[PDB]
Structure 1
C-alpha cells in the first residue's frame, strides 16, 4: 500500500505513535516519507547484508527475522515480511520498541538527516486528525 500523507498520519495516530516517547506525529510522518516514500512494501538491502523493511524501514540486524542476516536478533519477535503489510500495526509496535532504545528517533538515519530540526509539523498540515 502507498499511503497518502494525511492517511498515514491518521493511521499512526490511531496506533498511538503521536507523541510516543515525546515525538510529535509529524516526526513520524516525515520519517516515513523519507524512509519508504509512504510505501508499506519498501525494502532496501544495507551494505552489511541486513535489509530494511516497510513503511519505517525497520532493520533486520536487530528487530525482525528474515533468515538471511547472520548474527542478527529479532527483538520485535516477528518475521520481517510482516512489516510489509498494508496494515501498519506490526511496524508501529516495532517502531515503539526501537524509539524506546537509547538513541530515540536517531536510529532512523533519514529522520536524523532530513527531519530532525526541521518544521516537522508541516507534515500534518491540513490533515483532518
Structure 2
C-alpha cells in the first residue's frame, strides 16, 4: 500500500507513534516518506546483503528475519515480510523497539539525513489527526 501523507500520519498516530520516545509524529512521517515514499512494499538491499523492508525500511540485519541475511538478528521477532503489510502495525511495533534502543531515530538513515533538524511538523501539516 502507498499511504497518503496524512493517512499515514493518522495511522501512525493511532499506533502510538506521536511523541513516541519524544519523536513527534512528523518525524515518523518524514522518515517514512524518505525511507519508502510511503510504500509499505518497499524493499531495498543493503551492501551487506541485508534488506530493508516496508514503510520504515527496517533492515533484516537486525530487526526481522528474511531467511537470507545469514548471521543476522531478528530483534523485532517478525518475518520481514510482515513489514510489507498494508497494515503498518508490525512496522510500527518494530519501529518502537528500534527507536527505543538508545539511538533514537538515527537508526533511519533517511531520517537522519533528511528529517532530523528540519521542520518535521510540516509533514503533518493540514492533516486531521
Could you state the TM-score of these two structures normalised by the residue count of structure 1? 0.99
Equivalent-residue separation in structure 2 for 1:15 and 1:97 (angstroms): 13
CA RMSD across the alignment: 0.4
- Local SS of the residue matching 2:68: coil
Looking at structure 2, the residues matched to 60 and 19 of structure 1 have their Cα atoms a distance apart, in angstroms, of 25
Report deviation, 1:102: 1.5
Instruction: Give 4+ residue runs of structure 1 displaced > 2 Å after superposition.
Output: none
How many residues align? The count is: 129
1:13 and 2:13 aligned: yes
- Deviation of residue 115 (structure 1)? 0.2
1:77 corresponds in structure 2 to 77
**Cα deviation code 1:42-66 (max 9, x no counterpart):** 0000010000000000000010000
Write the distance in 2 (CA, Å) between the matches of 1:67 and 1:122. Answer: 38
Q: Structure 2: state its 5+ residue gaps.
A: none
5+ residue gaps, structure 1, are: none
* 1:103-125 Cα deviation digits (max 9, x unpaired): 11001000000000000001000
Q: What is residue 46 of structure 1 aligned with on the other side?
A: 46
Partners of 2:5 and 2:102 in 1: CA distance: 28
Query: Partner of 1:90: helix, strand, or coil?
Result: helix
**How far did residue 91 of structure 1 move?**
0.2
